[PDB]
Structure 1
C-alpha cells in the first residue's frame, strides 16, 4: 500500500489550522514520506470495537479519487484521538475566505458551484455517499486555484458517533430534514443553495433570531432568495431551484449541471488562484 504504516510518532505539527464540531485540524509533516498533509483529530468516548469499526469504515476514502474531493492518505486511532489524514489545502475554506473577503463575487461562486455539483456527483455515482454537511467550511481551496469537498459522511458509525455528541449544523438542514424525514439526496442540494446565498450576501441569509425559533422559521417560512438587483437572474434562478422546500420539486444534480448559470460560469476565464492572493495574501 502507498503508506500502509500510519502512526503518531511519524507526523510532525507545522501549525494548528483550527477547531470545529468535534475535531481539531493541523498542518503536519509526514516525516517518512515527505508528504504534507492536513490531520484532523477527533476525541471520542468509545469501546475499542466501535473505535476500530470507524477506522475500518474510513478506509473507503482510499478509493475517492476526484479533482473535486480532498485526497485521503490514511486514518488511525491514537492516544484516544482518531486521526483523519488528508490533502492539505493552503487556501483553507470558503468560510475563512468569506471572513477575509466580506462577500464572495458571483463569478468565483460559479466556479464553486461547478466543483460542488461535480464533487457530489462523484461521491454519489462512484461511492453512493451523501455529503450530509455542505457548508462554506466544508469547501476547501488552494493556491493552485482548486476547489474541493471535505468532511463528507463516508462512515455510518462516525456519523453515528457524531450525531449523539452533535447534530451540529442545524441551521444548514433542509426543511424535510428538520421535520424528521430521513436524509434525502435532495438535502445536499438545499445546503448548497443556502451556502451560495450566504457567500453571495456575506452573512447567514435568515432574519437574526434565537436558534429554536430558527428551526421553526425554516420549516414554516419561505426559503431565502438573492437580493434581486445586484445578482444576475441566472444565479438567482439557480439558487431558487436548489432552495425549493418540497424535496420532490427541488432541482437535482443532473438538472443543475446544465443550468444557464453553470453553462455561463463554465465559459468564463476566472483567475481564482490570483483572486485568492489578491484577497488572502499567499
Structure 2
C-alpha cells in the first residue's frame, strides 16, 4: 500500500490546529513520505480489542475519494491516543472562518451548500455513511478554495465509544433525533440547514437560553429562519426546506441539488480562495 505502516515517530508536529469534542488536531509532517497532514488524536481508555476494531473500521476511509471529502492517509494507535491522519486544510474550518469574518456572505454559502450537498451524496451513495455531525467546524476549507466534509461517522464503534464518554452537539440535532428517534439521512440535512443560517447571521440561530431549555425549545418551537430583507428568497427557501421539522416533509439531497439557490450559486463566479485569503490572512 501507499503508506502501510504509520507510527508516532514518523510524524513531526508543525502546529496544533486546536481541540474539539474528544480530539486534538495537529498539522504534521510525515517525515518518510514528505506528506503534510492533519492528525487528530482522540484520547480514549479502551480494551486493545476495541482499539483495534476502531482502527479496522477506520480503514474504510481509504476508500473515500471525493473532492468534497477530506482525504484519508491512515489511522493508528499510540501511547493512549487514536490517530486519524487526513488531508490538511490550510483554511481550517468554517467555524474558524466565521470567527474571523463575523458573517459569511450568501454567495460563499451557496458554494458551501453545493460542496456539502455533494459530499453527503457521495458518502451515502458510495459508502452508505450518514455524516451524523454536520456543523461549521466539520466543514473545512483551503487556499485553493476547496470546501470539504470531515468527522463523519465511518466507524460504528468509534461512534459508540465517542457517545458514551461525551454528549456532543445536541444543539445541532434534529427535532426527531432529540425525541429519541434513531439517526436518519434526514438529520444531516436539518444540520446543514442550521449551519447555513448560523454562518449567514453570524451566530447560533436560537434565542439564548440554558441548554436543557434549548433541547425542549427545538422539539417544541418552530425551526430557525433567515431574516427576510438581507438574504435572497432563494437562500431563504433553501434553508427553510432543510429545516422542516417533519423528516417526511424535509427536502432530500436530490431535491436540494436542483434548487434555484443552488442552480443560481453554481453559475456564479465567486473567488472564495481570494475572499478566504483577504479574510484570514493567507
TM-score (norm 1): 1.00
* CA distance in 2: counterparts of 1:5 and 1:133, whole angstroms: 29
Q: How many residues align?
A: 282
How far is the alpha carbon of 1:166 from its aligned partner? 1.3
The residue that corresponds to 2:107 in the other structure is 107
**Shift of residue 50, structure 1, vs aligned partner:** 0.4
Query: Secondary structure of 1:239's match?
Result: helix
Q: Does 1:192 align with 2:192?
A: yes
Q: Find the aligned partners of 1:145 and 1:85 in 2 and give their Cα distance.
A: 21
Distance 1:61 1:231 in 2: 37
Q: Deviation per CA, 1:61-110, whole angstroms, max 9, x where unpaired?
A: 00000000000000000001000000000000000000000000000000
User: How far has the Cα of 1:158 moved from its partner?
Assistant: 0.2
Shift of 1:255: 0.2
Secondary structure in 2 matching 1:107: helix
1:277, 1:247 → 2: CA distance?
38
Correspondence for 2:54:
54
Partner of 2:259: 259
* C-alpha distance in structure 2 between counterparts of 1:163 and 1:108, whole Å: 33
Per-residue Cα deviation, 1:122-167 (whole angstroms, up to 9, x for no partner): 0000000000000000000000000000000000000000000112
- Ranges of 4+ aligned residues in structure 1 off by more than 3 Å: none
Supply the RMSD in Å over aligned alpha carbons.
0.3
Give secondary structure in 2 for the equivalent of 1:278: helix
Partner in structure 2 of residue 211 of structure 1: 211
- Structure 2 residues without counterparts, runs of 5 or longer: none
SS in 1 for 2:106: coil
In the other structure, the counterpart of 2:165 is 165
Structure 2: distance between partners of 1:5 and 1:128: 27
Whole-Å separation in 1 of the counterparts to 2:49 and 2:16? 30
Q: 2:238 aligns to what?
A: 238
Structure 1 residue 120 displacement after superposition = 0.1
3-state DSSP of counterpart to 1:269: coil
Q: Deviations over 1:32-84 (max 9, x none)?
A: 00000000000101110100000000000000000000000000000010000
Following the alignment from structure 2 to structure 1, what is the Cα–Cα distance between the partners of residues 12 and 149?
25
Alignment partner, residue 247 of structure 1? 247
- Cα distance between partner residues in 1 of 2:188 and 2:47: 31
Q: Distance in 2 between matches of 1:174 and 1:166?
A: 18
1:18 maps onto 2:26 in alignment? no
* Deviation (angstroms), 1:220: 0.1
Aligned to 2:81: 81
